[PDB]
Design a protein around this ligand. Sequence first.
Ligand SMILES: NC[C@H]1O[C@H](O[C@H]2[C@H](O)[C@@H](O[C@H]3O[C@H](CO)[C@@H](O)[C@H](N)[C@H]3O)[C@H](N)C[C@@H]2N)[C@H](N)C[C@@H]1O
Ligand SMILES: Nc1ncnc2c1ncn2[C@@H]1O[C@H](COP(=O)(O)O)[C@@H](O)[C@H]1O
Length: 175
Amino acid sequence: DTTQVTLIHKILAAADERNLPLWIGGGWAIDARLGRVTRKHDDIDLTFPGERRGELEAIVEMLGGRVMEELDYGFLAEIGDELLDCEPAWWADEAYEIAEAPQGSCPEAAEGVIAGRPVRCNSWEAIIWDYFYYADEVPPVDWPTKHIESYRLACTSLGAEKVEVLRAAFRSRYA
Ligand SMILES: NC[C@H]1O[C@H](O[C@H]2[C@H](O)[C@@H](O[C@H]3O[C@H](CO)[C@@H](O)[C@H](N)[C@H]3O)[C@H](N)C[C@@H]2N)[C@H](N)C[C@@H]1O
Ligand SMILES: Nc1ncnc2c1ncn2[C@@H]1O[C@H](COP(=O)(O)O)[C@@H](O)[C@H]1O
């Protein structure tokens, strides 16, 4: 969506004004790290400081949107027709961390680009990590192409050995 790209800019601009860091996650995070739009994305994934949820909600409402229901891992919001999938991160020692995610999931540096603009986005490890859950719940043979090819891009970018080490950590933690 041209709509999603512009909505991302609008959200980040509003967050910047509030000195509120926000990380782009999921599909858009992959494209941000690649610096190229590769794929339609169902929604916009956001990671936010859990202790400043109120400020994110205010941004959403400022933009004519609304906060919808709680999710198992965060909350859902909406601007126009577009859905915002929002997950909190919490201050660790010198960075924010998503609960039950790899260390370094919310890097301070803006390490991606969307439509020429630098953006904060979740790490490759954090991105990959969520595919592990997905694989436990949905047989990868039933994954749509949009998710399959994005997963493979992430694996290509991170490297096969690092992915398998991360998978081992995932399996071990949840066994
Ligand atoms: N960090 C711990 C959590 O990791 C994963 O959640 C991940 C969710 O599955 C992600 O949501 C995605 O998957 C959900 C379905 O689970 C879709 O409804 C949603 N549109 C899609 O973006 C969401 N965008 C990020 C979140 N980390 C696990 N599925 C649940 C776990 O509690
Ligand atoms: N049905 C699902 N169950 C669990 N995880 C999912 C599901 N769909 C997507 N995901 C994960 O969430 C990430 C972000 O999805 P998206 O918001 O569609 O970009 C994907 O890259 C997958 O890792």
